[PDB]
Design a protein around this ligand. Structure first.
Ligand SMILES: CC(=O)N[C@@H]1[C@@H](O)[C@H](O[C@@H]2O[C@H](CO)[C@@H](O[C@@H]3O[C@H](CO)[C@@H](O)[C@H](O)[C@H]3NC(C)=O)[C@H](O)[C@H]2NC(C)=O)[C@@H](CO)O[C@H]1O
Length: 540
């Protein structure tokens, strides 16, 4: 007679191809990429002949086979593809094979193939749009937004984006290499801990707790191997396989290492670590370079060199070559993007007409034109055009676009920036003709999270009532709110100025719109980004 029917033993059924060490703070120890997950199954036979061969089947296909030598057995084997499998144990002899009932096993991998799709309802004022304009609709999500801002990946209105950028991936380095982090309490030390044992100029993760270990919706079980932002982003990719999720390297406080990459030894090590990062974290679709900025005038006053423009072009070429090789190794398309200053003086430090041939998209940072760092020269921080009271205003969106076009950049490369926050001042005074921007300020506006910066959600929720004046400047295409009794002035984007930017993108055949940062919108800004670029209402 055929063997008795085996009973699969109770035991762990959750396995991982990329293993995460739960007691490690150094990135080198935190993550271990294997070629395959080590899987184990045991069984007991309570009634019958134990057969002469035991097999472990996954979806009917043998993963392991060995002699059946007693009433219990154990099998250890490797599984090299992520997903969920119906596992069975079969006992066979010359008279037949008898298979157990199936037990699901989970083999995790960083494409999220083990995860249920993270398909969450739109929140706040977000309305559904189909991505059918063919234009970029991008936004940055900040790793630290999960703390005080409580804005997690399940709150992203992901169906309303083509590109979701994750800010920010650091580059390892201590004194002289990441000194801009010392301005933020604990932040330099946190990077040194993550990079312990790791060579300078390789990428790492700044906050591994937020990125990988914090419990979040859909990844709360203790043995879910990928939690935090990365676990949710993997599940988001399962829900939106056409969403491009790009890691953004740099930003305001993690850009200092780029200034050393004139040394090709360091630049090669960096590019190689990006390749390894993309091989490790398979849900990411490329890389965004947010080097702020070639030539300096970023956070660090002691960095910046006339060599930087040449370094940037080389870096983009070499990243592109690395990504092209990864693309053909994988069959995937990978994107290379960069967030860049929108000031003409900054733009002309770089030959974007050459670099563009390596780049899928240029994220023109047409915001932060004005702010509380300068209390004397006030103006619209993200306007399309100059205002009527100062038509020679240098820092406008159109002036940045025109600087790129004048170099020879193809318009389709250029993605125009919108701000989901205001900047502003307090004590504005001494202004003419009811235009507060012609005065001067005594200090920054009180901010939502830090001085001088206000979430758009808070502008809309608190500063469009009471004593606050509201004005839309139709020459600049720029709203502002002003409280006369305290001299608080806030400059920001709203649905109408975003609509002007979208129409401008379509009229000039630019590439689309992007925003910073997604946590600060109540939905009005991203709704207008989508509507103004011609995306249809509804779901696809
Ligand atoms: C540019 C950049 O590198 N990031 C800055 C942020 O780091 C900073 O936000 C704060 O981030 C730290 C972690 O990096 C948060 O600390 C966490 O705090 C919680 C309790 O609040 C604690 O349980 C976490 O374990 C702890 N992690 C670490 C490593 O400290 C801190 O709470 C964040 N604060 C906020 C925003 O809520 C922001 C400040 O806005 O500035 C960035 O530039």
């Amino acid at each position: 007679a055929a063997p008795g029917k085996p009973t699969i033993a109770w035991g762990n059924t959750k396995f991982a191809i990329v293993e995460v060490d739960q007691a490690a703070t150094a990135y080198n120890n935190l993550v271990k990429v294997k070629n395959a997950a080590d899987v184990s199954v045991s069984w007991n036979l309570w009634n019958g002949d134990t057969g002469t061969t035991a097999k472990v089947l996954l979806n009917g296909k043998e993963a392991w086979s060995g002699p059946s030598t007693g009433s219990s057995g154990t099998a250890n084997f490797k599984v090299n593809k992520g997903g969920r499998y119906q596992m069975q144990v079969a006992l066979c002899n010359a008279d037949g094979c008898t298979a157990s009932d199936a037990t699901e096993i989970v083999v995790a991998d960083t494409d999220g193939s083990h995860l249920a799709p993270l398909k969450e309802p739109l929140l706040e004022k977000n309305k559904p749009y189909k991505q059918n304009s063919g234009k970029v609709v991008g936004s940055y999500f900040v790793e630290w937004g999960v703390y005080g801002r409580n804005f997690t990946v399940d709150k992203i209105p992901a169906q309303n984006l083509t590109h979701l950028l994750y800010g920010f991936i650091p580059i390892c380095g201590g004194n002289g290499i990441n000194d801009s982090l010392k301005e933020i309490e604990g932040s330099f030390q946190a990077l040194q801990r993550s990079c312990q044992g790791r060579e300078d100029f390789k990428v790492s993760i700044h906050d591994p707790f937020a990125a990988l270990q914090k419990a979040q919706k859909g990844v709360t079980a203790w043995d879910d191997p990928y939690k935090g932002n990365f676990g949710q982003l993997m599940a988001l990719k399962q829900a939106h396989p056409d969403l491009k999720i790009l890691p953004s390297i740099g930003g305001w406080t993690l850009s200092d290492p780029f200034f050393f990459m004139g040394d090709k030894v360091k630049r090669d090590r960096f590019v190689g670590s990006v390749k390894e990062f993309l091989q490790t974290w398979k849900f990411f679709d490329g890389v965004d370079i947010a080097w702020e900025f070639p030539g300096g005038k970023g956070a660090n006053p002691n960095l910046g060199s006339p060599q930087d423009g040449e370094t940037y072009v080389l870096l983009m070429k070499e990243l592109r070559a690395m990504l092209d090789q990864l693309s053909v190794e994988t069959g995937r398309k990978y994107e290379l993007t960069s967030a860049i200053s929108a000031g003409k003086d900054m733009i002309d430090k770089v030959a974007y007409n050459v670099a563009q041939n390596s780049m899928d998209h240029i994220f023109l940072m047409s915001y932060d034109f004005y702010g509380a760092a300068d209390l004397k020269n006030l103006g619209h921080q993200t306007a399309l055009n100059a205002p009527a009271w100062k038509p020679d205003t240098a820092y406008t969106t159109v002036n940045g676009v025109n600087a790129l076009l004048a170099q020879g950049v193809k318009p389709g490369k250029i993605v125009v920036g919108t701000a989901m926050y205001g900047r502003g001042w307090t004590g504005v005074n001494g202004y003419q003709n009811n235009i507060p921007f012609t005065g001067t300020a005594t200090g920054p506006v009180k901010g939502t999270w830090e001085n001088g910066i206000v979430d758009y959600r808070q502008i809309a929720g608190q500063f469009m009532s009471g004593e606050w004046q509201y004005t839309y400047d139709a020459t600049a295409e720029a709203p502002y709110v002003f409280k006369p009794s305290t001299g608080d002035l806030i400059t920001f984007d709203d649905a109408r100025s975003v609509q002007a930017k979208g129409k401008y993108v379509l009229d000039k055949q630019l590439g689309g719109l992007f925003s910073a940062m997604i946590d600060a919108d109540n939905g009005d800004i991203l709704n207008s980004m989508n509507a103004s670029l011609g995306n249809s209402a509804g779901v696809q």
